[model samples]
Target: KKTIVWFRRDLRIEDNPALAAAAHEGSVFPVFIWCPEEEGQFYPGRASRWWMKQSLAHLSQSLKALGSDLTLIQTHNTISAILDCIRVTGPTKVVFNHLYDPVSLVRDHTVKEKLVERGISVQSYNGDLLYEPWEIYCKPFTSFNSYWKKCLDMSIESVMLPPPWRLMPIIWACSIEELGLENEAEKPSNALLTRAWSPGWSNADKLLNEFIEKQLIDYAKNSKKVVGNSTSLLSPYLHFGEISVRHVFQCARMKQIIWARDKNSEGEESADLFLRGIGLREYSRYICFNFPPWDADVDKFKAWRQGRTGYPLVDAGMRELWATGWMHNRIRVIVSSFGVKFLLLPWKWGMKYFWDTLLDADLECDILGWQYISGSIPDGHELDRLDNPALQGAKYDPEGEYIRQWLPELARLPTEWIHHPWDAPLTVLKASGVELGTNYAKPIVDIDTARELLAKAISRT
Candidate 1:
């Protein structure tokens, strides 16, 4: 009996139910399909697509080291591609880890039904998330609703098994570069991304270990510091399944348990805080599973995407996104709130832009974050509550360092006026070399009027 291990978002080999279980059975054929149609309307953005190209390269090398080759297939019809491979290999079973995103669920069901009809056994495991979104309820949703507090108390899988010693490749596997992933990114652009990131499973584990040892203890105080990486920058790794989410959950919980034995509140507190972030990642899938389709204006969305709405802190955040393909969580919240509430832009429009740019753009997380910020969901922010961006910058980036870092046009401006260049006296503006409406833009809409427009939008909606 032969089996096919179909890789999706769960890219790693360890603690992966589908791949590990297939290894124990018969000859295992591993394959990754890059079908744009499988993604539906939310095709990955540049950063995400680039990251995919890089991460898949790493996973391919790891599999070859284990005596198996990862077959890469590019197609519009994912199931047809898989079936073609199955016909060539005559595999008896198709196994995979499930993805819970809105489009994936429907696609997975279609694939499963088609595979079953052809006399191939279809099996799926929920290895992508800590708990099955539907089953995480009982202490289920009642518990997950309490911020994964109840689920955290439950037992997690602690033992992550090692990769198989050897495996049989079907001998027809193609080269990774031949898959056209390289063509998607220019050579110079891809090189810069590689310098900033290591996308393989082994590298991801190393990053996790380093974070637990050095930063997890101070994450509570330090997560708020956005000038640098304040928390575990693990989202891209986690999203690609380069590292197991459960592995992260267990390791942090293990530290919490050890700290509790020594009467350390701060360690446990920081660990809990970090764990909650992972939990929120888990919750994103749940939220996306339930959300309705969101609609918005294309012209209005263009302003937010280009960082031209003329709000300093918001523009800085947007520009940072354009520069690095990632932004701080604090910055994400502020910019999203302004785009949704202050600008009265459609939350879905902002969500789409984030999806296009963020390196860690998981559909579930993007949908949930924007929905929460826009007050679309029940637990979201109240639509009437507009946070002042200048005030937020004063509290978070009091020295104007974050603003200056992304908006170099304001580099010479005094910290006192960097976040509000228009308000600065002519002396300050001239010293700063700022020409409003030229090098830098004037505020598109003053705060007071923007507030009135926002309140009016909320009233009608």
Candidate 2:
């Protein structure tokens, strides 16, 4: 029996249901199709494309190691490409995983329909979310509370599968370069990414284990801290499907089981909190697989995107995102809230920016975060709740380490003035070698002005 394993976001070997099923039957032909035109406005931005490129290279090598080749194809029509693969390879069935995003849903449905029409068997598994979107019930989709509570109440069963030991080899393979995920112009910036991320299943497993052993215990206390790797830096890994969420959940729960014997209350609490974080991730997909921007101020928007927002914390967050393609969750909220509430920019603009820039550019989470912060959703932060970035900076990044790391211009400033440089006296600013307009930007909009604007807008509503 021959099977074609159609690879998408589910890039891993272990716990990949489709791949495991394909390997179990007999010969496996693993293929990845890249159609940049198909993505439309949802085309991943440069950074996201870089990560995917590197990840595909990693996946290709891993498959090669297993005596199988990952055939790389770039074409305008995905269904035509798959049909060609079937005609050439003569596979009896095509197996793959699921993607919940609206674009993927339409594409996958059409692909499935076409394959079935040709008498080719097609199967897709829930390789992304912990539970199917339909599995969780919420009347009118009220809040994350009810959705998560229902999830927590249900008992989770282990369904993880091991990677196939060996795979039947294919006769032909295409060079990964043909995918054009990255170009020569992007090489310099993308080279920096290799230093930061190891984008394959084995590395993902190692990182997950390291988090469970060392970080999960303190996750509750440090998850919100902006300075360090407080939270599991697994968003990219999870987003790429390099690691399984079920595996992460199960590992944390196993630790919780261990801590239960030792009566480690904090450990148990931290595990619970970490699981809730995972629940939020699940909720992102659930909301997206279930239900599914912005204004002018070009100069101001340029400042925001370039990390010259003149708000220390906001600038640092945006700068970090630019340099690293990732941001701390707490800082994500702070920056996003700052854009929508503090700067009065449209939430959709921020959402689109995030979709483009974030390495974990998940559509569902981006929509949820933007809508929640902007009060577009009922259960979200109130429209009037304008978080003072100065206050938030002091609270989350107390020592200014995060700000200093990302905003080098503010490195010389004391903790007192690091977050709100506009408030610092001229003498202090001079002593710190800071020239407000020359080296750094002054506040784009007065905080109080933004606050009053928000108040007036709310009243008008």
C-alpha RMSD of candidate 1: 2.9
Name the candidate that leads on lDDT.
Answer: 2
lDDT of 1 by residue, 1-461 (tens): 58999898877877888888888887898999887766778778767878888888888888888888888888878888889888898889989999887677888999999988988899998778877666555432422457476666676554676767677666334566666655544657766776667777888989999999888989988876666667799999888888899888888988989998997998989988888898888878765664441235565567777887677788888887877778888889888887766566766677777887788998888877776786666667777887866677777788888878888878898888777777889877888789899988888768787677777776887
Tens-digit lDDT track of model 2 for 219-240: 9889769887678899988988
Q: After superposition, how far is residue 19 of candidate 1 from its true place, in Å?
A: 1.0
lDDT of 2: 0.85
After superposition, the stretches of candidate 1 with alpha carbons farther than 4 Å from their true spots are 138-147, 156-159, 171-174, 182-187, 290-303, 457-461
TM-score per prediction, in order, is: 0.91, 0.95
Indicate the residue-level lDDT of 254 in model 2: 95
In model 1, pairs of residues that clash are 136-140, 137-140, 137-141
